[PDB]
Amino acid sequence: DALNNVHITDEQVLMTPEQLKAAFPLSLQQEAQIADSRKSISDIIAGRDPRLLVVCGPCSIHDPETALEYARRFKALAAEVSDSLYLVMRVYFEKPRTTVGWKGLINDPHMDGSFDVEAGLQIARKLLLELVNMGLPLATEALDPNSPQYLGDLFSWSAIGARTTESQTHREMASGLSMPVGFKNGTDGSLATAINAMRAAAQPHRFVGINQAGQVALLQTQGNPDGHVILRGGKAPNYSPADVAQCEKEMEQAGLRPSLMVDCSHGNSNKDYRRQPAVAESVVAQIKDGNRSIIGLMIESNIHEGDACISWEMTDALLREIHQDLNGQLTARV
Amino acid sequence: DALNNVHITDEQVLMTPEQLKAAFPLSLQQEAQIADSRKSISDIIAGRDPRLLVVCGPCSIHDPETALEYARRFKALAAEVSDSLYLVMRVYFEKPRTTVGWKGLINDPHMDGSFDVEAGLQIARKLLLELVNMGLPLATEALDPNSPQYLGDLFSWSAIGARTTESQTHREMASGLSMPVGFKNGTDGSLATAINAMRAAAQPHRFVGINQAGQVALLQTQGNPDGHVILRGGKAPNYSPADVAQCEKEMEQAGLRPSLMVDCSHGNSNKDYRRQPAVAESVVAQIKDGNRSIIGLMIESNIHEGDACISWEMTDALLREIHQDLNGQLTARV
Ligand SMILES: N[C@@H](Cc1ccc(O)cc1)C(=O)O
Numbered sequence: 001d002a003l004n005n006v007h008i009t010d011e012q013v014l015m016t017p018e019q020l021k022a023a024f025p026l027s028l029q030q031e032a033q034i035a036d037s038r039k040s041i042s043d044i045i046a047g048r049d050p051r052l053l054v055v056c057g058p059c060s061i062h063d064p065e066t067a068l069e070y071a072r073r074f075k076a077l078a079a080e081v082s083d084s085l086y087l088v089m090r091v092y093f094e095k096p097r098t099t100v101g102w103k104g105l106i107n108d109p110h111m112d113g114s115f116d117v118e119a120g121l122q123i124a125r126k127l128l129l130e131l132v133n134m135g136l137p138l139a140t141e142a143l144d145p146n147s148p149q150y151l152g153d154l155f156s157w158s159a160i161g162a163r164t165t166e167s168q169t170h171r172e173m174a175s176g177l178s179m180p181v182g183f184k185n186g187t188d189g190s191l192a193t194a195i196n197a198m199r200a201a202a203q204p205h206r207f208v209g210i211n212q213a214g215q216v217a218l219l220q221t222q223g224n225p226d227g228h229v230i231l232r233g234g235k236a237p238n239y240s241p242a243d244v245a246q247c248e249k250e251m252e253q254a255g256l257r258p259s260l261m262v263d264c265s266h267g268n269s270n271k272d273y274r275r276q277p278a279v280a281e282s283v284v285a286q287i288k289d290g291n292r293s294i295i296g297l298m299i300e301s302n303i304h305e306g307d308a309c310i311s312w313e314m315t316d317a318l319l320r321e322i323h324q325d326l327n328g329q330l331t332a333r334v
Numbered sequence: 335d336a337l338n339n340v341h342i343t344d345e346q347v348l349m350t351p352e353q354l355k356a357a358f359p360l361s362l363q364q365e366a367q368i369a370d371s372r373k374s375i376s377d378i379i380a381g382r383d384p385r386l387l388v389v390c391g392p393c394s395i396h397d398p399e400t401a402l403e404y405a406r407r408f409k410a411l412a413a414e415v416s417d418s419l420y421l422v423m424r425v426y427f428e429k430p431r432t433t434v435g436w437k438g439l440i441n442d443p444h445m446d447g448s449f450d451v452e453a454g455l456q457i458a459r460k461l462l463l464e465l466v467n468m469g470l471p472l473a474t475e476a477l478d479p480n481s482p483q484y485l486g487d488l489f490s491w492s493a494i495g496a497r498t499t500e501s502q503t504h505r506e507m508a509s510g511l512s513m514p515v516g517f518k519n520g521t522d523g524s525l526a527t528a529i530n531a532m533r534a535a536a537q538p539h540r541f542v543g544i545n546q547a548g549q550v551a552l553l554q555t556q557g558n559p560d561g562h563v564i565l566r567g568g569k570a571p572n573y574s575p576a577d578v579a580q581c582e583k584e585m586e587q588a589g590l591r592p593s594l595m596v597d598c599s600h601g602n603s604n605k606d607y608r609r610q611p612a613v614a615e616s617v618v619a620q621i622k623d624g625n626r627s628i629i630g631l632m633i634e635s636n637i638h639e640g641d642a643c644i645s646w647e648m649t650d651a652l653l654r655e656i657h658q659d660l661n662g663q664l665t666a667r668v
């Protein structure tokens with residue numbers, strides 16, 4: 001053709017969500033465990049559970065074995081602290097916002113720039129199934145309408161940022177996701193985008209995505225009742241008590257019940273791993289001081305540091321310190 | 335299902351690109367016309383055609399009749415300046431840059447929050463076909479891997495921004511597009527993203543999109559040889575002679591022959607319509623003083639003024655004045 005596919009040499013129909021799930025299905029036990037973790041995170045966000053939601057893990061998943069080692073250490077740490085903190089392992093296969101670099105375990109699993117999406121999807125789903133069998137709740141970030149259909153049944157929490165809310169085809173996708181959702185503030189620091197997205201997510205909507213057969217589809221949503229804001233900083237950090245108070249005020253003026261998670265990383269640490277514990281400790285001080293809107297923390301943490309990810313030893317010490325400082329000023333708030 | 339589509343109430347398969355094009359096919363005259371306008375734009379970008387490429391039109395399309403009214407004036411003006419300026423009408427249905435508001439003619443053609451994408455696609459393609467039959471080359475912006483399959487056969491030029499380059503599944507989509515492509519600089523003013531994307535677009539690549547049957551597919555690309563940079567400001571405008579010289583320097587240092595278009599709007603006018611003409615005039619001055627890299631202009635222009643769109647009268651006066659000023663210096667470059 002003179003106009004169509006002039007610069008396309010080949011086209012290959014991808015494996016569908018149907019086929020991926022049939023090749024790597026969930027067991028009844030795994031399904032029940034995931035539903036229960038989603039319910040627990042919903043209860044925490046809604047204030048019915050006193051514990052603090054801690055989404056912690058690597059900046060981006062590198063390979064299955066390292067992720068499993070981190071998961072072993074993380075589950076070990078979580079069993080000791082779960083009476084005050086609900087640890088959820090973030091499994092991000094890719095990093096937002098790059099013109100450059102490795103495309104991640106799903107797109108380039110062989111790590112040679114070959115773009116083998118189909119093998120990456122199977123590797124990722126197998127790894128996620130293994131993580132679920134370890135008893136770990138998993139956290140993701142929604143960046144497109146396709147990956148929820150392939151892998152969303154394995155996650156208990158999702159972050160929503162500008163890649164969703166600034167599209168028009170699927171800006172309302174959060175209202176149709178089966179998991180609790182946290183809405184990141186604007187890159188400039190605007191809370192309005194996150195607040196509007198959180199309010200809209202509780203309502204029925206329609207968006208363009210795919211069906212289980214990999215076909216472009218129009219989806220009608222029911223509304224997602226489990227939403228909260230994520231404070232991740234803008235040009236300047238926004239975790240301070242004054243910024244938290246401003247967030248609570250803007251949420252209350254929107255008619256929402258103030259519920260927010262503090263990202264200790266990117267915009268509140270300014271890309272430096274050394275600042276994350278300071279943000280976490282400021283949040284702990286605020287919770288001690290009768291703050292009730294802060295429902296969770298986000299922490300970027302690898303086995304080693306240096307990346308804005310803190311080392312595993314720092315993560316262990318920090319989570320233990322938070323648990324010791326958060327004695328029962330969290331049962332105080334139910 | 336207790337895990338899948340909990341908050342989804344309905345799902346229907348959207349009309350495929352195949353079916354859309356079967357319902358609203360291109361006549362062979364329009365096909366040859368679009369191919370010829372693509373070739374002419376490619377010639378301008380490569381420096382074979384001395385004329386200046388001018389992409390100009392509404393901030394976004396409001397409804398079909400307003401678009402047609404604009405189009406008749408724009409075609410009339412294009413006829414009278416066609417020896418020096420090659421006019422291309424920008425037809426942007428979606429806006430980038432929002433989380434609230436009207437979803438545009440494609441998603442909400444009834445403009446009542448209905449999200450009737452299937453009717454919007456047909457209305458949009460009907461409008462585009464009528465615009466093509468008026469003899470107007472058309473310009474779009476690629477914000478999505480699916481909309482090119484539905485409507486790209488009607489466009490002669492496409493802008494490429496962060497929505498493409500800062501995804502990791504279709505970051506190379508431009509290398510597989512059948513039309514010349516302009517790469518916008520980063521929001522911060524960084525030229526590296528646009529330059530790297532422009533270089534990568536000339537190479538064979540792979541990206542995830544859809545086939546003509548609406549199925550998720552992996553596309554292998556041949557490479558797109560018709561690329562240029564779009565200067566659209568950052569934290570400050572970047573159209574000045576010093577900024578253009580720096581862009582030339584960075585492009586040459588990347589191995590690219592300097593070829594750029596100056597956006598007289600968003601970052602370069604500070605979203606103040608009153609400043610758009612000055613920008614354009616500056617570009618004119620630079621060409622009169624020996625510039626060889628500036629190949630085009632982009633102008634946001636509607637029937638009425640202030641949106642940072644300029645009025646049609648401002649547009650007409652500005653384009654005529656540019657045409658008067660440019661006559662001889664353009665053939666002297668090639
Ligand atoms: N299946 C997803 C919802 C969804 C459906 C279609 C999509 O394209 C994206 C997401 C869930 O249960 O959360």
Ligand SMILES: N[C@@H](Cc1ccc(O)cc1)C(=O)O
Binds near residue numbers: 007486513542553
């Ligand atoms: N059909 C487009 C190329 C394309 C193919 C698949 C996509 O998902 C997107 C774009 C063109 O000819 O320009």
